[PDB]
Amino acid sequence: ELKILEIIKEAIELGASDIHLTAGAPPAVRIDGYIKFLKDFPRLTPEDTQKLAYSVMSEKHRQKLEENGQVDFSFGVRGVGRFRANVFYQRGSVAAALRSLPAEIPEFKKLGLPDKVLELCHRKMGLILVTGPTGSGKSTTIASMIDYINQTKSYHIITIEDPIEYVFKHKKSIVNQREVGEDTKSFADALRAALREDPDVIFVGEMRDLETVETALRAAETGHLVFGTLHTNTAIDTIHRIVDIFPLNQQEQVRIVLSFILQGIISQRLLPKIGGGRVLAYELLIPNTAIRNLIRENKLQQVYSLMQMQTMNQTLYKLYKQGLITLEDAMEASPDPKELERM
Amino acid sequence: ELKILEIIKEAIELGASDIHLTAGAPPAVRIDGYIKFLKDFPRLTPEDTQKLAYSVMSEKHRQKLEENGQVDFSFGVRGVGRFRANVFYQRGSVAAALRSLPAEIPEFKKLGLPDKVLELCHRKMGLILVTGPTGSGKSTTIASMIDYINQTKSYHIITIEDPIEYVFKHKKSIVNQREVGEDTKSFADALRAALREDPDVIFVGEMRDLETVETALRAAETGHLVFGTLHTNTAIDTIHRIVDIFPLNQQEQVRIVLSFILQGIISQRLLPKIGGGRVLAYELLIPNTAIRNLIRENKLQQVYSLMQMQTMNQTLYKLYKQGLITLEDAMEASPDPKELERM
Ligand SMILES: Nc1ncnc2c1ncn2[C@@H]1O[C@H](COP(=O)(O)OP(=O)(O)O)[C@@H](O)[C@H]1O
Numbered sequence: 133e134l135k136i137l138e139i140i141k142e143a144i145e146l147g148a149s150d151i152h153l154t155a156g157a158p159p160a161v162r163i164d165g166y167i168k169f170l171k172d173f174p175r176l177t178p179e180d181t182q183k184l185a186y187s188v189m190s191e192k193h194r195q196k197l198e199e200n201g202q203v204d205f206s207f208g209v210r211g212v213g214r215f216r217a218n219v220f221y222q223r224g225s226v227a228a229a230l231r232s233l234p235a236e237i238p239e240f241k242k243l244g245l246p247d248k249v250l251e252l253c254h255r256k257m258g259l260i261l262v263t264g265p266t267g268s269g270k271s272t273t274i275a276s277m278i279d280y281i282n283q284t285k286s287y288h289i290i291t292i293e294d295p296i297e298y299v300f301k302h303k304k305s306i307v308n309q310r311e312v313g314e315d316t317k318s319f320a321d322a323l324r325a326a327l328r329e330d331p332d333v334i335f336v337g338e339m340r341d342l343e344t345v346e347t348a349l350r351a352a353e354t355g356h357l358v359f360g361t362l363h364t365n366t367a368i369d370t371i372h373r374i375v376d377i378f379p380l381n382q383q384e385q386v387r388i389v390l391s392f393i394l395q396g397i398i399s400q401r402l403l404p405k406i407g408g409g410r411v412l413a414y415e416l417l418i419p420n421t422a423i424r425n426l427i428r429e430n431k432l433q434q435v436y437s438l439m440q441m442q443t444m445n446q447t448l449y450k451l452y453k454q455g456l457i458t459l460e461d462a463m464e465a466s467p468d469p470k471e472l473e474r475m
Numbered sequence: 476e477l478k479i480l481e482i483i484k485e486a487i488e489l490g491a492s493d494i495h496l497t498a499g500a501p502p503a504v505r506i507d508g509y510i511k512f513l514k515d516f517p518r519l520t521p522e523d524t525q526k527l528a529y530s531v532m533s534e535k536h537r538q539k540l541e542e543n544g545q546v547d548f549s550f551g552v553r554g555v556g557r558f559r560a561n562v563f564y565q566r567g568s569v570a571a572a573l574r575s576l577p578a579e580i581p582e583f584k585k586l587g588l589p590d591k592v593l594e595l596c597h598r599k600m601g602l603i604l605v606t607g608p609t610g611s612g613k614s615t616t617i618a619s620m621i622d623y624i625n626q627t628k629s630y631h632i633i634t635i636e637d638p639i640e641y642v643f644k645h646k647k648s649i650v651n652q653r654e655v656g657e658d659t660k661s662f663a664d665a666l667r668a669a670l671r672e673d674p675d676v677i678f679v680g681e682m683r684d685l686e687t688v689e690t691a692l693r694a695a696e697t698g699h700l701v702f703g704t705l706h707t708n709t710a711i712d713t714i715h716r717i718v719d720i721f722p723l724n725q726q727e728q729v730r731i732v733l734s735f736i737l738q739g740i741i742s743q744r745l746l747p748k749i750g751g752g753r754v755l756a757y758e759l760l761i762p763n764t765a766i767r768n769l770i771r772e773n774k775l776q777q778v779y780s781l782m783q784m785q786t787m788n789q790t791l792y793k794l795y796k797q798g799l800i801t802l803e804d805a806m807e808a809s810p811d812p813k814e815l816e817r818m
């Protein structure tokens with residue numbers, strides 16, 4: 133009767149985002165943001181949610197659920213696509229929460245970014261940054277850029293992910309994708325090796341460690357175009373954030389580096405549309421003659437003024453000068469009420 | 476059908492720099508900077524890239540690919556020459572990236588350095604430094620110097636490398652080459668022993684550690700001519716860099732030492748030629764009566780002024796006073812626009 137290899141069917145048939153298997157309820161499913169218990173066939177599940185859970189768990193996983201009452205892993209079904217699971221000892225039993233992994237990568241056009249971004253991928257070496265609150269298109273924006281490359285250039289692209297969100301088909305180039313925690317054990321002892329694996333483009337899924345940003349930066353300035361992703365929210369704060377987290381025995385030299393190596397910056401926030409709902413706000417900073425020198429001299433604040441590539445407001449407005457984002461959401465996402473309200 | 480001992484053939488036949496074996500593609504190859512998939516015979520490789528990988532891996536290697544998802548090692552084929560590999564768990568499989576190791580050492584003449592450099596090797600003890608951005612001839616410049624010696628002197632030369640780039644034929648002297656990570660486990664507990672092995676010339680491939688530079692310096696001032704390689708870019712900054720990284724309870728005495736022991740300095744940058752492409756820029760500092768005393772008194776900046784052996788610009792120009800390096804690259808490599816532009 134009960135088979136996870138089939139529970140996933142009725143879920144993918146309804147278009148669920150997440151499916152949850154607990155102990156007292158019948159397999160559940162998250163649809164349109166709601167939790168609905170699919171009693172369609174399965175009945176209140178027994179503490180043998182451990183049975184279904186194993187019909188997916190290897191051994192380095194099943195034993196891991198024992199050291200600590202939980203495991204975070206990804207597995208693939210030849211049926212539909214790939215899923216992300218997280219089994220854990222819930223209330224003296226076993227509970228699982230399978231998510232879903234993107235089988236297809238979006239056409240950069242569909243994203244929303246300008247036709248300027250597709251030029252960054254065409255650079256030769258530097259530090260392309262994509263920042264925003266968790267849930268703002270970062271992953272997608274990156275996979276569209278890394279995939280645009282994989283299509284038009286003859287490179288060996290190397291990505292260090294946790295977990296591998298999007299996957300890549302070998303096209304005009306050879307892609308190598310290592311999952312931090314399954315293929316290596318860190319972004320460092322993986323980015324460290326990326327250095328000596330002849331990769332043309334490196335990719336760190338997350339850069340919240342000194343040593344990580346340390347190398348992400350040493351690599352960016354050694355011949356490779358690296359893509360990094362901080363959780364900031366604006367341009368000014370980004371470049372600021374990375375230089376600040378460095379001992380002050382050369383916080384300026386770092387400003388110097390971040391000025392010779394910074395290839396681009398694109399912060400994002402996913403606001404709603406009076407359509408289906410998704411549209412994207414953002415701030416794009418493409419260094420020039422002045423800002424380059426500015427950053428180094430740290431005449432920061434003043435650089436924001438030269439920004440006639442596009443402040444977050446010249447954008448928070450541009451979406452409304454048409455009829456998409458309402459005035460309040462153009463504020464509940466606006467990095468500054470003051471800058472706007474004058475439009 | 477598939478045999479790494481043969482994949483290397485078709486690669487060396489095309490003159491590739493790197494060859495890459497991934498999982499979805501057919502063995503690939505990096506030619507003229509490009510990634511080309513040699514479908515010549517091999518077909519889309521199966522996850523049995525682990526089979527080819529092992530037809531090269533010993534045991535202290537195959538097991539190492541298990542502790543961490545990667546191994547960095549060198550192996551030799553009696554066919555052509557020696558190669559550098561780096562196998563790693565890529566996307567739940569195994570991926571390899573074999574490079575290539577120089578079978579022959581260049582005639583010092585072909586390098587580009589003046590006829591002054593070949594005199595340093597003839598000194599009796601001191602600290603010969605070769606610095607530059609990774610990719611500037613350091614390895615080659617050194618192997619040409621260490622080999623010029625091996626040819627004209629009756630010495631026991633000892634080199635501590637990681638990895639052994641160039642190899643040496645016993646000529647008028649006996650060469651000993653230890654690979655850090657295979658023969659010993661460090662530049663220190665290897666340079667420490669070099670001290671008591673009666674070597675005439677010592678060689679540290681990399682000196683980015685206190686203890687390392689500590690001994691590289693204690694050895695240089697104990698009777699041996701040692702060759703070191705920092706990643707700096709100019710003379711002034713070099714000697715500066717090494718003294719600064721020393722607790723300030725005698726940063727001057729260190730300046731003192733670096734002034735009695737500094738035998739020479741030659742920073743490099745590989746610029747392009749309107750020919751095939753490679754020509755070399757550089758800054759050469761051969762201490763004298765003044766600079767010796769200068770360094771100690773730390774009247775640094777002023778020493779740069781006595782430099783009528785050759786500033787980086789008197790060079791960045793000398794290449795152009797002929798017709799090789801264009802004016803902009805004579806700047807995109809120039810350690811200072813100001814110093815030049817007056818030529
Ligand atoms: N530019 C965009 N426009 C509309 N929807 C987007 C855009 N970027 C991402 N999304 C959608 O938002 C969701 C999550 O985006 P994602 O990048 O995976 O989160 P994160 O920013 O943490 O990496 C996905 O369902 C994705 O399709």
Ligand SMILES: Nc1ncnc2c1ncn2[C@@H]1O[C@H](COP(=O)(O)OP(=O)(O)O)[C@@H](O)[C@H]1O
Pocket residue numbers: 585586587588607608609610611612613614615616753754755
């Ligand atoms: N003086 C030079 N002139 C022209 N080409 C050079 C010179 N020195 C090195 N090269 C070439 O540049 C490449 C790398 O130089 P190498 O010294 O091995 O890198 P690194 O500076 O990191 O040690 C090699 O292919 C080498 O033949």
